[PDB]
Amino acid sequence: LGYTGLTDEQAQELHSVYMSGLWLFSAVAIVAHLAVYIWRPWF
Amino acid sequence: LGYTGLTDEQAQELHSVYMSGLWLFSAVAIVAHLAVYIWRPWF
Amino acid sequence: LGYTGLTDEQAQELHSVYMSGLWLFSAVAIVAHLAVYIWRPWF
Amino acid sequence: GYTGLTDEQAQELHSVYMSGLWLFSAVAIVAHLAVYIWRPWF
Amino acid sequence: LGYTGLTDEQAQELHSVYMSGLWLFSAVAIVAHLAVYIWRPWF
Amino acid sequence: GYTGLTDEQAQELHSVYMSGLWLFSAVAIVAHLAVYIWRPWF
Amino acid sequence: LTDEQAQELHSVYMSGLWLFSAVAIVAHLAVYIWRPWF
Amino acid sequence: MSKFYKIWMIFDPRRVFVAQGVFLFLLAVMIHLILLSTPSYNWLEISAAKYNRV
Amino acid sequence: MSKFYKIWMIFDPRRVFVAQGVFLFLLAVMIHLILLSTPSYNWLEISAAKYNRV
Amino acid sequence: MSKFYKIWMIFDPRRVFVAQGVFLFLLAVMIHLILLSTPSYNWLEISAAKYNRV
Amino acid sequence: MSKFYKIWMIFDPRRVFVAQGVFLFLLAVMIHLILLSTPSYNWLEISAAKYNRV
Amino acid sequence: SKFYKIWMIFDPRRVFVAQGVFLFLLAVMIHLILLSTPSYNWLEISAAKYNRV
Amino acid sequence: FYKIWMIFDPRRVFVAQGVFLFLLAVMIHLILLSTPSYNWLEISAAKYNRV
Amino acid sequence: AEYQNIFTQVQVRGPADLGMTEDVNLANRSGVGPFSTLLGWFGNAQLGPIYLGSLGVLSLFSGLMWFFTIGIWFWYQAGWNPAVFLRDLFFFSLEPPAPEYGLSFAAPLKEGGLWLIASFFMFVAVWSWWGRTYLRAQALGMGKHTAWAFLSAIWLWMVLGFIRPILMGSWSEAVPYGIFSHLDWTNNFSLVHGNLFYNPFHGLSIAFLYGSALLFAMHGATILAVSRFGGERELEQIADRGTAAERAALFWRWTMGFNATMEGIHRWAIWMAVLVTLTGGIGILLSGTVVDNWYVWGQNHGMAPL
Amino acid sequence: PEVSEFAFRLMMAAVIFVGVGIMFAFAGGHWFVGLVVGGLVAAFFAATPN
Amino acid sequence: ALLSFERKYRVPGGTLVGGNLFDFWVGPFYVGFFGVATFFFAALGIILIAWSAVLQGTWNPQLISVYPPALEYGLGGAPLAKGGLWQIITICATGAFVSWALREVEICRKLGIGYHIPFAFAFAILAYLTLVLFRPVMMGAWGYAFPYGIWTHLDWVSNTGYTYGNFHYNPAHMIAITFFFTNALALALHGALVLSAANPEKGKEMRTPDHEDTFFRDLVGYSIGTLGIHRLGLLLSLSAVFFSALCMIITGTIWFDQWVDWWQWWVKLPWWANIPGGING
Ligand code: BCL
Ligand code: BCL
Ligand SMILES: CC[C@H]1c2cc3[nH]c4c(c3C)C(=O)[C@H](C(=O)OC)c4c3nc(cc4[nH]c(cc(n2)[C@@H]1C)c(C(C)=O)c4C)[C@@H](C)[C@@H]3CCC(=O)OC/C=C(\C)CCC[C@H](C)CCC[C@H](C)CCCC(C)C
Ligand SMILES: COC(C)(C)C/C=C/C(C)=C/C=C/C(C)=C/C=C/C(C)=C/C=C/C=C(C)/C=C/C=C(\C)CC/C=C(\C)CCC=C(C)C
Ligand SMILES: COC(C)(C)C/C=C/C(C)=C/C=C/C(C)=C/C=C/C(C)=C/C=C/C=C(C)/C=C/C=C(\C)CC/C=C(\C)CCC=C(C)C
Ligand SMILES: COC(C)(C)C/C=C/C(C)=C/C=C/C(C)=C/C=C/C(C)=C/C=C/C=C(C)/C=C/C=C(\C)CC/C=C(\C)CCC=C(C)C
Ligand SMILES: COC(C)(C)C/C=C/C(C)=C/C=C/C(C)=C/C=C/C(C)=C/C=C/C=C(C)/C=C/C=C(\C)CC/C=C(\C)CCC=C(C)C
Ligand SMILES: COC(C)(C)C/C=C/C(C)=C/C=C/C(C)=C/C=C/C(C)=C/C=C\C=C(C)\C=C\C=C(/C)CC/C=C(\C)CCC=C(C)C
Ligand SMILES: CCCCCCCCCCCCO[C@@H]1O[C@H](CO)[C@@H](O[C@H]2O[C@H](CO)[C@@H](O)[C@H](O)[C@H]2O)[C@H](O)[C@H]1O
Ligand SMILES: CCCCCCCCCCCCO[C@@H]1O[C@H](CO)[C@@H](O[C@H]2O[C@H](CO)[C@@H](O)[C@H](O)[C@H]2O)[C@H](O)[C@H]1O
Ligand SMILES: [Fe+3]
């Protein structure tokens, strides 16, 4: 059923927590780039 | 064959997920190349 | 024979798919080389 | 019998090995013919 | 005589095939030398 | 026989060894004659 | 080393030494004719 | 051109994903570093000349 | 030629693909780097001369 | 002459196929490097002169 | 003369064949290298001078 | 004669291998010495005779 | 002189005697080349006007 | 004559030792390779198996790219001539960018750009190998002494190529990739900073390079001396002290006046070797950043006449 | 004479390495030709005792 | 003051000179015949270095130096204030080192162990004798030996090295440096590997030499063994010192010019000396 001994419902929950932290990290990064680009564009 | 023990059901389900990410990665790269070419072509 | 443990039927399946990728790889190479020769020929 | 093959297994294997060998030389001859027209070395 | 585990029949057919390869190699060598001698003789 | 060879084996072995020895020397003599005809070194 | 075995070896060895030295005698003799060093 | 899904019946999925992930990371940085090395594509220096910076 | 499928019965598919994958990438990286070194095919510099970027 | 298949009753096909592939590629790259070094066969630099790219 | 076949009893075919082929390849490379060094027989330079390429 | 007794002390395998390496090196040395002397360098001698160099 | 092949290994004497003899031969030959009066190649090259 | 236990007079060979699987992922571990008779005259004859996992792939492929990048630059520097490449192999070099660029990454590939590419491959390959060195010990339930001792050597490696060039403000301070090239860098590094001999940490670093040579000659000779009492198996001497450990200790007790244990001598060994590169990193990091002339600094600190 | 076969081979190789080195340095036109040919043969000679 | 297991090892015998005249222990030290010699030579040489300091006029230990006799004296004696004291201290140091090596041989016999340790110490002695005695004797004067100062014997190394340019190009130097770096690398690996086996992760059983082989086969694909690593450690250091003394016995006696120019024999081999391109062509 897997390579790591993790049930599918366990994998479903773990991935949902991960993607939540990834959207949070990505959304903060987009603000950082958007603020830096307005301050001093690199294009 | 039989080097890893993944069944046809597992192999089809593994390939379908992997090839899904391949086109997701390839689409982002294609857009990036098109964007850079408009800004500054190399040919 | 059979150093790898593959049967004759399994070897044909492996080789048939291997050539499919090989021809796909070369077709991109032929188009790539044809594009370069039209652009900047070396002969 | 050092490699543990039979007599017919060597016959079968060598037939394919020569089949690839003549395939390689056929490309090499064409490659060498193409270069000689472009720029002979003799 | 021994020293390897071969037999009289095994050594004779081993020599027959080997020596035939020796003449085949020398057949190419004579032709190659002859063409070189026509082209740029060293004598 | 302190090396494993019998006496009768030794005679056959030395017969073949000299057969190659004279054959090799014979080809050398022909080569030296050709070189001497070409340009003598004496 | 058996004495009969050791006797054969010394005899055959001396047989080889005389043959080699005999040809060298001719070889030195030939060079003296071709070019005397003394 | 469809039976490629069988490749996961031969190759360990864990090793393949790791090698592929390593390859793309090393490849991406090398190309980005090449573009910085070429003065015609260094996007940091290009903007400096365009916007009159240091 | 039609009997080339027996190479896999001799060579491990896992080992051949690893050796081939490392082979092709280093062959391809070598060829690009040769063209990059030669001024006649450095496409990064050829574009710069064409569009007056330097 | 039509009895050369018996070489494969002496040599393991795996070690010959590996050794031959190493030998031929090393031989081929060596010849290509000899031609690149000789300026009368440097097809990269020959083409530059012919189309006056430099 | 006809008794030379018995060397295959004394000498192992496997080590003889490997040692022989290594001897011949080095001999061929050694002779080819000598001819390349002599300007009279260096065929790459002879073609260049004959066809006026350098 | 009686020279065949030599194979009852010396192992034939090493004798034939030792003789082979000795024979090849002795031949190359003579070939190399001839090339070193300009009087017998057959490659360059043919160059002068045929108006090559 | 009989016990020379007993005191010493018969294998050792032949290798030691033969190898020294060959080296002594090539050295004596090389000296003749080294001196400009017994280089039979150069002597003939001057004799036949081929140098 | 007397046997000195320097070469094995008799070799015994049996089944190939596949190792023990404490927590090791047995899939990643390969199969046993050949047996070397030549290596068997000195140590073990068995080659392999080797564990190539996730950090093995990253380290070996990055190390391949670092090695292959420098090789292609050498072929370019040879004009693609196999003979010229062979001739000038020890003279070719891949050099860091010119000091005019400072730490900037805008240097052309022929003027220190390939150096940055090769340096990145080396950075990934060396650091990934430290992780692999750590993880290989963990899977066997062993201590991390190998990982932390390696970290001492990485310290000098990072000071030479990364940390100090950042602190000096230019990549031109770093080490070129060549055989005779990095020897010239070493010779010129001393001349620029005024006789590096008077760097106190270079002096200490040498004290532990000689100390390591002194200590391994002592320890290696001691064990071969008491190897007749089963002294080579130091691990079982620690568990149950035998006459080998007592004679080894009593030799240095009667000679020097103090000795070590069978386990404590390996704490001297590891600590003597790590101080070679731990001290060397500080002395190199202090050169130019804090002291730009070690002979003049020495004169103000004893060490030299005024 | 109580000399090991390995030790006797090392004595006899040392002569060969010095000997064959001189003859091929002469023929090779450089002492490095003598070194490689003289060294390789002695490395092969000393590694194959009885 | 004995180790708990030392009583059964203190037996009379294994003395090259004497047998009971100097067969006793002073504390833990064994006072042999050569222990009396070692102490006398060690003590005299130290006090001469102390005396040479008052002739020099300094008490800072890092400034004290004993210089060899000047190059004008050749290979003979010298005044004590100039270089005569160096010759006595060199004799005293030579006597102390050989006595220390000879005293270790008596300890080996009394414990019944092999003579690997005194043999390995003689390599250090021969390297030292090369620098102060053998090499100066060849060159012709005592003034080529290094002085006996903490920071001034470094000045001898620096000055001697730069006489021949960059000393990195001495081929025997490169071999010796390679052995020194390998010896320190192997010492770090050897100490760490044994310590990790004896001190496992936590609450774990002590590991076994089968774990020691397995760790290094997993890591680098090979394992020299427990006997192999100790033979290697001894041989790396003896080789490092052998090529150390080799590189200095040939410097200034056979080779006299820059060591960089030596490597032009390779770059000027006849078959590629004239091929254009590269660094030297
Ligand atoms: C101007 C001078 C003349 C000339 C003057 C002389 C004179 C004078 C002599 C020779 C002799 C010889 N010359 Mg002439 N020679 C000239 C030019 C040449 C040239 C050349 C390229 O031009 C060559 C190849 C030779 C070659 C020879 C040899 C045929 C012969 C030396 C044999 C020998 O070395 O035995 C020694 C070698 C061996 C014994 C080989 C065996 C050793 C092995 C390797 C070790 C033993 C191992 C084995 C298993 C043990 C068992 C068997 C043992 C042999 C017992 N000469 C010139 C032209 N030459 C000598 C001779 O006549 O010999 C009878 C001699 O006295
Ligand atoms: C004229 C030159 C100067 C001089 C200039 C320098 C400079 C500059 C330095 C030294 C350094 C040192 N000098 Mg100094 N040194 C001089 C004179 C000496 C003398 C002498 C007798 O005169 C001696 C014995 C020494 C000895 C030493 C060492 C104590 C120290 C080097 C430690 C070391 O091992 O680093 C070598 C080890 C490393 C660099 C770590 C490497 C580990 C990495 C992580 C592994 C990478 C592997 C790589 C990728 C390859 C992989 C291959 C595959 C895996 C197979 N020097 C003279 C005065 N010296 C170094 C030091 O730190 O001292 C302060 C240093 O930087
Ligand atoms: C050959 C391999 C390495 C090695 C091995 C080695 N050394 C050894 C041994 C071995 C096997 C011992 O058994 C022996 C020992 O007992 O060690 C604890 C020893 C030893 N190696 C020592 C030191 C040492 N080894 C060094 C090097 C090496 N030793 C090699 C790299 C160095 C270096 C590189 O500098 C030093 C300093 C000692 C700790 C010890 C020998 C002790 C001894 O000789 O005791 C009797 C003598 C005295 C007590 C001192 C006498 C003092 C003199 C009378 C006056 C001073 C003279 C001196 C020359 C002045 C120097 C001035 C400046 C240059 C500083
Ligand atoms: C210095 O000199 C230079 C370099 C300039 C000139 C020298 C040039 C030289 C020597 C060039 C040499 C070139 C050579 C020999 C090239 C060979 C190229 C080859 C053989 C390429 C082959 C490529 C094949 C590919 C990429 C195939 C890929 C296939 C797949 C990815 C499919 C995967 C396989 C599957 C899915 C099988 C599934 C079936 C089962 C049962 C699992
Ligand atoms: C520096 O000196 C110069 C170079 C100038 C001149 C010097 C030149 C010199 C010294 C040259 C020396 C030349 C020599 C000694 C050349 C010898 C050449 C020989 C003998 C070559 C032999 C080749 C033999 C071959 C290629 C045989 C091939 C055999 C086959 C291909 C058959 C395959 C074998 C099989 C199938 C085994 C059969 C197995 C069974 C079970 C029957
Ligand atoms: C500068 O001056 C120089 C150095 C050039 C002049 C100096 C010249 C010198 C020192 C020349 C010395 C020349 C010598 C000593 C030459 C010796 C030549 C010999 C002994 C040649 C012998 C050759 C023997 C051969 C070729 C034998 C071949 C045998 C076969 C091919 C048959 C194979 C059968 C075998 C091996 C075993 C059969 C097995 C059974 C069971 C019967
Ligand atoms: C420096 O000197 C220079 C370079 C200037 C001149 C020197 C030149 C020299 C020394 C040149 C040397 C040239 C040589 C020796 C060339 C050799 C060429 C050869 C041997 C080519 C052989 C090619 C063989 C090939 C390509 C084999 C193909 C084999 C296959 C495709 C294998 C097929 C087998 C399969 C599929 C499985 C078989 C197993 C079963 C059970 C059927
Ligand atoms: C025919 O040969 C082929 C082509 C097949 C392969 C041949 C390869 C050859 C000939 C390789 C030669 C390699 C050599 C000579 C290597 C020598 C290396 C040496 C001597 C290195 C010495 C010191 C290097 C150091 C200290 C490097 C330190 C680097 C770092 C500490 C990290 C560097 C990272 C930096 C500077 C920043 C990178 C970050 C970014 C974002 C680019
Ligand atoms: C132990 C292995 C190495 C042994 C090397 C020992 C030292 C050399 C021994 C042979 C000495 C004579 O070796 C010879 O010397 C001359 C000196 O110019 C050089 O030879 C060079 O000049 C001579 C003429 O003087 C030419 O014939 C020759 O073509 C040329 O290469 C070579 O060095 C070698 O032909
Ligand atoms: C172990 C390593 C260190 C060993 C140190 C050995 C030092 C002791 C040397 C003993 C031998 C002395 O050797 C002797 O030295 C004196 C020194 O004036 C030399 O004396 C020489 O110089 C004096 C200087 O005024 C002149 O009279 C004259 O030029 C000559 O006699 C002798 O020519 C030499 O025979
Ligand atoms: Fe130990």
Q: Are residues N133 and N153 in the same domain?
A: no
Q: For helices P209-220 and N114-139, what crossing angle results, to 10°?
A: 160
Q: Are I14 and H11 in contact (CB under 8 A)?
A: yes
Q: Are H47 and A42 in contact (CB under 8 A)?
A: yes
Task: Compute the CA torsion angle N50, N52, N58, N62 (nearest 10 deg).
Answer: 30
**Ligand 3 atom closest to the CA of P101, numbered from 1:** 13
β-sheet bridge partners, residue P25: P30
DSSP secondary-structure letter at H8? G
CB-nearest partner of J44 from I10, I11, I38? I38
CB atoms within 10 A of CB N164: 19
In a 13 Å sphere around the CA of N275, the CA atoms on its Cβ side amount to 17
| Residue located nearest, by CA, to atom 44 of ligand 3 | P97
Q: Are residues P93 and P49 in the same domain?
A: yes
Distance from the Cα of residue N247 to its chain's centroid:
32
Ligand nearest to the CA of O15: 9
Q: How far, in Å, is the centroid of ligand 10 from the Cα of P138? A: 16
DSSP C3-33: TT---HHHHHHHHHHHHHHHHHHHHHHHHHH
Contact F3 L6 (CB under 8 A): no
Contact M40 F39 (CB under 8 A): no
Burial degree of F7 (CB within 10 A; 0-12, 13-18, 19+): exposed
Q: How far, in Å, is the centroid of ligand 8 from the Cα of N154? A: 14
Residue recorded with tokens 């009686």: L2
E16 is in which domain, residue-wise? 1-43
CA pair distance P91, P37, nearest whole angstrom:
13
The answer, for H5 touching chain A at a CB cutoff of 8 Å, is: no
Tokens of G32: 């003296």
CA pair distance N102, N174, nearest whole angstrom:
11
Burial B1-40 (b: 16+ CB within 10 A, else e): beebebeeebbeebbeebeeeeeeeeeeeeeeeeeeeeee
Mutating which of J36, J47, J52, J54 best tests the C interface, going by the most C Cβ atoms within 10 A?
A: J47
CB atoms within 10 A of CB L9: 17
β-sheet bridge partners, residue N46: N35
Is G10 labelled a binding residue?
Answer: yes
β-sheet bridge partners, residue P31: P24
Q: Are L53 and K46 in contact (CB under 8 A)?
A: no
The answer, for B18 touching chain C at a CB cutoff of 8 Å, is: no
Q: Are residues N121 and N251 in the same domain?
A: no
Domain boundary residue, one of P131, P163, P195? P163
CA pair distance P195, I27, nearest whole angstrom:
44
CB atoms within 10 A of CB N282: 19
Q: Are N185 and N269 in contact (CB under 8 A)?
A: no
Burial degree of N141 (CB within 10 A; 0-12, 13-18, 19+): middle
Q: If you compute the radius of gyration of chain O from its CA atoms, what whole number of angstroms results? A: 12
Strands (E), chain I: none
Residue type, N149: A
Q: Are residues N118 and N161 in the same domain?
A: no
Tokens of P171: 């081929």
Q: How far, in Å, is the centroid of ligand 7 from the Cα of I5? A: 19
Tokens of J14: 């795996």
Is P33 part of a structural domain of the chain? yes
CB atoms within 10 A of CB F8: 9
Residues of D in contact with C43 (CB under 8 A): 38
In a 13 Å sphere around the CA of A21, the CA atoms on its Cβ side amount to 5
Q: What 3-state class would DSSP assign to P29?
A: strand
Q: Are L8 and M12 in contact (CB under 8 A)?
A: no
Q: What 3-state class would DSSP assign to O27?
A: helix
CA pair distance N252, P28, nearest whole angstrom:
10
Residues closing a segment before a gap in chain C (C–N exceeding 2.5 Å): none
Is L31 labelled a binding residue?
Answer: yes
Strands (E), chain O: none
Q: Are B12 and H5 in contact (CB under 8 A)?
A: yes
Q: What 3-state class would DSSP assign to M44?
A: helix
Mutating which of P125, P217, P238, P262 best tests the N interface, going by the most N Cβ atoms within 10 A?
A: P217
Helix spans in chain J (H): 13-37, 43-50
CA pair distance N40, N10, nearest whole angstrom:
9
Q: If we measure between CA atoms, which residue out of N202, N212, N207, N208 comes closest to residue N280?
A: N202
Strands (E), chain P: 24-26, 29-31
Interacting residues of A43 by C-beta distance below 8 A, sequence separation 6+? A37, B39, H43, H47
Tokens of P268: 């000027």
Tokens of I5: 């499928």
Contact partners for chain J, using 3 or more CB pairs closer than 8 A, are C, D, E, I, K, N
CA pair distance N202, N204, nearest whole angstrom:
5
Q: If you compute the radius of gyration of chain K from its CA atoms, what whole number of angstroms results? A: 20
Residue type, N16: A
Q: Are P65 and P53 in contact (CB under 8 A)?
A: no
Q: How far, in Å, is the centroid of ligand 11 from the Cα of I19? A: 39
Q: If you compute the radius of gyration of chain F from its CA atoms, what whole number of angstroms results? A: 17
- Tell which one of P41, P100, P181, P232 to mutate to probe ligand 3, the residue whose CB is within 8 A of the most ligand atoms: P100
Please give the interface size between I and J, counted as residue pairs whose CB atoms are below 8 Å apart: 19
CA pair distance H2, C13, nearest whole angstrom:
12
Ordered domains of chain I (ranges, CATH): 5-51 (4.10.220.20)
Please, what's the largest Cα pairwise distance for chain L? Answer: 58
∠ CA P214-P220-P223, rounded to 5°? 50
Closest CA of chain J from E42, distance in Å: 25
CA pair distance N300, P52, nearest whole angstrom:
23
Q: How far, in Å, is the centroid of ligand 2 from the Cα of P184? A: 11
Q: Are G23 and M20 in contact (CB under 8 A)?
A: no
Nearest CA in chain I to H46: I53
Task: Compute the CA torsion angle A16, A22, A28, A34 (nearest 10 deg).
Answer: -120
Number of domains in chain B: 1
Q: How far, in Å, is the centroid of ligand 5 from the Cα of K17? A: 9
Q: Are P99 and P38 in contact (CB under 8 A)?
A: yes
CB-nearest partner of D14 from J8, J12, J41? J8
Interacting residues of B24 by C-beta distance below 8 A, sequence separation 6+? none
CA pair distance P13, P107, nearest whole angstrom:
10
3-state SS of F1-42 is CCCCCCHHHHHHHHHHHHHHHHHHHHHHHHHHHHHHHHCCCC
Residue recorded with tokens 């002073």: P26
CA P258 vs CA B18, N91, O31, P251, P269: distances in Å: 63, 17, 21, 10, 19
Is P279 part of a structural domain of the chain? no
CA pair distance P275, N78, nearest whole angstrom:
10
Task: Compute the CA torsion angle N78, N81, N84, N86 (nearest 10 deg).
Answer: 100
| Residue located nearest, by CA, to atom 26 of ligand 4 | C22
3-state SS of chain E is CCCCCCCHHHHHHHHHHHHHHHHHHHHHHHHHHHHHHHHCCCC
Contact K9 E12 (CB under 8 A): no
- Tell which one of N94, N101, N122 to mutate to probe ligand 8, the residue whose CB is within 8 A of the most ligand atoms: N122
- Tell which one of N214, N218, N223 to mutate to probe ligand 3, the residue whose CB is within 8 A of the most ligand atoms: N214
Domain boundary residue, one of P117, P144, P163? P163
Task: Compute the CA torsion angle N150, N153, N159, N162 (nearest 10 deg).
Answer: -50
Q: For helices N243-256 and N200-225, what crossing angle results, to 10°?
A: 130
Query: How many residues comprise chain K?
Result: 54
DSSP P132-190: IIIHHHHHT-GGGSPPS-TTHHHHHHHHHHHHTS-GGG-HHHHHHHHHHHHHHHHHHHH
| Residue located nearest, by CA, to atom 8 of ligand 1 | G28
- Whether the CB of K50 sits within 6 Å of ligand 6: no
Ligand nearest to the CA of L3: 1
Q: For helices N145-158 and P171-198, what crossing angle results, to 10°?
A: 140
The residues whose Cβ lies within 5 A of ligand 11, an ion, are: N 234
CB-nearest partner of H9 from B6, B16, B42? B6
Contact L12 F13 (CB under 8 A): yes
CA pair distance I14, N27, nearest whole angstrom:
13
β-sheet bridge partners, residue N177: N94
Q: Are G23 and M18 in contact (CB under 8 A)?
A: no
Sign of CA dihedral A8, A11, A17, A23: negative
Q: Are P139 and P160 in contact (CB under 8 A)?
A: no
P124 is in which domain, residue-wise? 1-163
- Whether the CB of F24 sits within 6 Å of ligand 6: yes
DSSP secondary-structure letter at A41? -
Stated as kind and residue range, the H or E segment containing N67 is helix N54-77
CA pair distance B8, G32, nearest whole angstrom:
92
CA pair distance J53, J44, nearest whole angstrom:
11
In a 13 Å sphere around the CA of P249, the CA atoms on its Cβ side amount to 13
Q: For helices N54-77 and H13-37, what crossing angle results, to 10°?
A: 40
Residues of F in contact with K4 (CB under 8 A): 16, 19-20
Q: What 3-state class would DSSP assign to A26?
A: helix
Q: Are residues P154 and P175 in the same domain?
A: no
Tokens of P70: 């000047």
Interacting residues of K35 by C-beta distance below 8 A, sequence separation 6+? K41, K42, K43, L43
β-sheet bridge partners, residue K16: none
Q: How far, in Å, is the centroid of ligand 1 from the Cα of M23? A: 10
Say which experimental method was used: cryo-EM
Interacting residues of P183 by C-beta distance below 8 A, sequence separation 6+? N212, N213, N216, P233, P236, P237, P240
CA pair distance A19, N50, nearest whole angstrom:
36
Sign of CA dihedral P94, P98, P101, P104: negative
- Whether the CB of L34 sits within 6 Å of ligand 1: no
CA pair distance N218, P124, nearest whole angstrom:
11
Q: What 3-state class would DSSP assign to H12?
A: coil
| Residue located nearest, by CA, to atom 31 of ligand 9 | O29
Closest CA of chain I from D7, distance in Å: 17
N177-178 vs N93-94, strand pairing mode? antiparallel
Tokens of N63: 């190390």
